[PDB]
Write a protein that binds this ligand. Structure first.
Ligand SMILES: Nc1nc(=O)c2ncn([C@@H]3O[C@H](CO)[C@@H](O)[C@H]3OP(=O)(O)OC[C@H]3O[C@@H](n4cnc5c(N)ncnc54)[C@H](O)[C@@H]3OP(=O)(O)O)c2[nH]1
Ligand SMILES: [Zn+2]
Length: 359
């Protein structure tokens, strides 16, 4: 695949400043309103907007992703069934009145109740109280996000998150292997930042827990993504222009297009851009030098990514970049047939100069 061809695709994928500014304006308004009103509850009084950038998320330009962080003080986690990613939330001391005490189902903080209250407050307040027309989508299966549709054209996913300024869980110890890439110093200062928790329940055979939370490091992902090169001046000049972000955009667009084409079937529904992002991070670990990401070698680099991703589909092994023992492509999460299907489609695309980019 020619580099100029891929860069022609990415060239034709760039959206105008107006289309971004308008939607960003509407979403900004709705988000500010929802936040200001969310602060009317004692539980969500300390709510706050988490800066994930709200951009570089969809390649779908009408889809946004905002995260509502909620500050919780000195929480104690309990790893559930050694899933390494899902935990129970407890509080060290509750003699002092706790805003979230209403959601306590014993000593364990109920995620489903918090999500229910959250979604209910939002559902009540979105009823045209603003000047914008907003509606709430149907409750998704096992999704922590509350999605809203604005003007029947804009999609906004709102995910509640508990912020813990404590040290990261032991399951993340062997994760974030960015030492040879972004230096151990940067890894150090990154792990000093807080970590988040989203209301995501874990699978227990033929049942669900609805009381567990999952680890989230979206802020860390944004940080390492926007500061990606080994050299501090990476992509700040003509001599040090790389193609990392370009590769990620291309991969995301590939998966997006394949999911779209095969929307009628349910094969590619379980695959998400996070699998792509994770694979990209692992390739970034494998190729730490900026010289391995030269722009003229785009077509090469991208291929590499593709190959690796396919491997992950073939071997059914995609470790979480922060939680190495958490496999995203386990047979328990995604069935073999779906990954074989996706493998087939991606292989077809790669072998035929990617006709799925032609749209
Ligand atoms: N908004 C949202 N936040 C979540 O944390 C989340 N977890 C699951 N789901 C949804 O549940 C269904 C089945 O599980 C899927 O439909 C899936 O939707 P999705 O298309 O995946 O959502 C894309 C974003 O959701 C995030 N991400 C998705 N998976 C994970 C994960 N395992 N760990 C941490 N974050 C994850 C990720 O940031 C990625 O970024 P982009 O917006 O750029 O695509 C989530 N949806
Ligand atoms: Zn760069």
């Amino acid at each position: 695949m020619g580099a100029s061809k891929l860069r022609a695709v990415l060239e034709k994928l760039k959206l105008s400043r107006d289309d971004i500014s308008t939607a960003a304006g509407m979403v900004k308004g709705v988000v500010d309103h929802l936040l200001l009103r969310l602060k009317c509850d004692s539980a969500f009084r300390g709510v706050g907007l988490l800066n994930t950038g709200s951009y570089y998320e969809h390649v779908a330009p009408n889809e946004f992703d905002v995260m509502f962080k909620l500050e919780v003080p000195r929480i104690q986690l309990e790893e559930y069934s050694n899933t390494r990613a899902y935990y129970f939330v407890k509080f060290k001391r509750n003699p002092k009145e706790n805003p979230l005490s209403q959601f306590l189902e014993g000593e364990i903080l109920s995620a489903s109740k918090m999500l229910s209250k959250f979604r209910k407050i939002i559902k009540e307040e979105i009823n045209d109280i603003k000047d914008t027309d907003v509606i709430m989508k149907r409750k998704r299966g096992g999704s922590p996000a509350v999605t809203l549709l604005i003007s029947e054209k804009i999609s906004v996913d709102i995910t509640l998150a508990l912020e813990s300024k404590s040290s990261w869980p032991a399951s993340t110890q062997e994760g974030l292997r960015i030492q040879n890439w972004l230096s151990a110093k940067v890894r150090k200062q990154l792990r000093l930042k807080p970590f988040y928790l989203v209301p995501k329940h874990a699978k227990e055979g033929n049942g669900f827990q609805e009381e567990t939370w999952r680890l989230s490091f979206s802020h860390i992902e944004k940080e390492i993504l926007n500061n990606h090169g080994k050299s501090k001046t990476c992509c700040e000049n003509k001599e040090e222009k790389c193609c990392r972000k370009d590769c990620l955009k291309l991969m995301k667009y590939l998966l997006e297009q394949l999911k779209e084409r095969f929307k009628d079937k349910k094969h590619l529904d379980k695959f998400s851009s996070y699998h792509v992002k994770t694979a990209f991070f692992h390739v970034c670990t494998q190729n730490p030098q900026d010289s391995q990401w030269d722009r003229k070698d785009l077509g090469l680099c991208f291929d590499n990514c593709v190959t690796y991703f396919l491997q992950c589909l073939r071997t059914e092994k995609l470790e979480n970049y922060f939680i190495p023992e958490f496999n995203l492509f386990s047979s328990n999460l995604i069935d073999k047939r779906s990954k074989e299907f996706l493998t087939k489609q991606i292989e077809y695309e790669r072998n035929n100069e990617f006709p799925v980019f032609d749209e």
